[PDB]
Enzyme design. Structure first.
Site, short mmCIF file in Angstrom:
data_model
loop_
_atom_site.label_atom_id
_atom_site.label_comp_id
_atom_site.label_asym_id
_atom_site.label_seq_id
_atom_site.Cartn_x
_atom_site.Cartn_y
_atom_site.Cartn_z
N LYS A 16 0.84 -1.20 0.00
CA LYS A 16 0.00 0.00 0.00
C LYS A 16 0.88 1.25 0.00
O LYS A 16 0.57 2.24 -0.67
CB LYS A 16 -0.93 0.00 1.21
CG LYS A 16 -1.80 1.24 1.33
CD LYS A 16 -2.86 1.05 2.42
CE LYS A 16 -3.62 2.35 2.67
NZ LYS A 16 -4.88 2.11 3.44
N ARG A 42 2.18 1.65 -3.59
CA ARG A 42 1.14 2.17 -4.47
C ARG A 42 0.85 3.66 -4.22
O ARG A 42 0.70 4.44 -5.17
CB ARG A 42 -0.14 1.33 -4.33
CG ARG A 42 -1.28 1.80 -5.22
CD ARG A 42 -2.50 0.90 -5.10
NE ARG A 42 -2.99 0.78 -3.73
CZ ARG A 42 -3.85 1.62 -3.17
NH1 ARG A 42 -4.31 2.66 -3.85
NH2 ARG A 42 -4.25 1.43 -1.91
N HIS A 51 2.77 5.93 -2.55
CA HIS A 51 3.87 6.89 -2.37
C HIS A 51 5.07 6.80 -3.33
O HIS A 51 5.93 7.68 -3.32
CB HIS A 51 4.33 6.90 -0.90
CG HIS A 51 3.23 7.23 0.06
ND1 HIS A 51 2.58 8.45 0.06
CD2 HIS A 51 2.65 6.50 1.05
CE1 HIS A 51 1.66 8.46 1.01
NE2 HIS A 51 1.68 7.29 1.62
N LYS A 74 -8.87 11.07 -1.81
CA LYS A 74 -7.89 11.12 -0.73
C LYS A 74 -7.41 12.56 -0.63
O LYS A 74 -6.99 13.15 -1.63
CB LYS A 74 -6.73 10.17 -0.98
CG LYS A 74 -5.81 10.03 0.24
CD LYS A 74 -4.60 9.15 -0.06
CE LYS A 74 -3.89 8.76 1.22
NZ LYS A 74 -2.52 9.32 1.31
N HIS A 121 4.24 3.72 6.12
CA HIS A 121 3.45 4.95 6.27
C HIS A 121 4.33 6.15 5.90
O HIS A 121 5.53 6.16 6.21
CB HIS A 121 2.89 5.01 7.70
CG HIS A 121 2.56 6.39 8.19
ND1 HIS A 121 1.37 7.03 7.91
CD2 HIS A 121 3.26 7.24 8.99
CE1 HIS A 121 1.36 8.22 8.49
NE2 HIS A 121 2.50 8.37 9.15
N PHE A 122 3.77 7.12 5.19
CA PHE A 122 4.48 8.37 4.92
C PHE A 122 4.08 9.39 5.98
O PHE A 122 2.91 9.78 6.05
CB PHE A 122 4.15 8.92 3.52
CG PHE A 122 5.08 10.03 3.06
CD1 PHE A 122 4.81 11.36 3.40
CD2 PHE A 122 6.22 9.75 2.31
CE1 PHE A 122 5.67 12.38 3.00
CE2 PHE A 122 7.09 10.75 1.90
CZ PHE A 122 6.81 12.08 2.24
N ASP A 123 5.03 9.83 6.81
CA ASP A 123 4.69 10.71 7.94
C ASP A 123 4.71 12.21 7.58
O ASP A 123 3.78 12.95 7.93
CB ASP A 123 5.61 10.44 9.14
CG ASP A 123 4.99 10.88 10.44
OD1 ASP A 123 3.82 10.52 10.68
OD2 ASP A 123 5.66 11.60 11.23
#
EC number: 4.6.1.18
Length: 124
Positions: free
Chosen positions: A7, A10, A12, A41, A119-121
């Site tokens: 995920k 896809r 990032h 989004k 995760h992109f922070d």
């Protein structure tokens, strides 16, 4: 279901370009990456570096995540990125995004074995 790692890839990763092409980059990418399927989004960052370079961030500078978790990592170097954010005229199903290209450090949360971004922070 999609794995957390897949995920992240896809949502990032965009290694196919060195930077955003035009003002329409985000509209095109948010759509083709299926981030406008059931809803728009609202915010999403694409990274224009190799998957290997982004994965390597998980062994770089360990920093806190915005939410307080301690599995975030900040890239030692700046990377080419594109921030995509809904504009005022954006209304599902007619999603509309502003495209902002920049070069910044990325911060990602990493998990698993292999230990990879999930995760992109933020970027700085």
């Amino acid at each position: 279901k999609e794995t957390a790692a897949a995920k992240f890839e896809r949502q990032h990763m965009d290694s196919s370009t060195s930077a955003a092409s035009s003002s329409n980059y985000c509209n095109q990418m948010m759509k083709s990456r299926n981030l406008t399927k059931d809803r728009c989004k609202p915010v999403n960052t694409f990274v224009h570096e190799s998957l290997a370079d982004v994965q390597a961030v998980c062994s770089q500078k360990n920093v806190a995540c915005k939410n307080g978790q301690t599995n975030c990592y900040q890239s030692y170097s700046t990377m080419s990125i594109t921030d995509c954010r809904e504009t005022g005229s954006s209304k599902y199903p007619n999603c509309a995004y502003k495209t902002t290209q920049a070069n910044k450090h990325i911060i990602v949360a990493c998990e698993g074995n292999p230990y990879v971004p999930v995760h992109f922070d933020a970027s700085v």
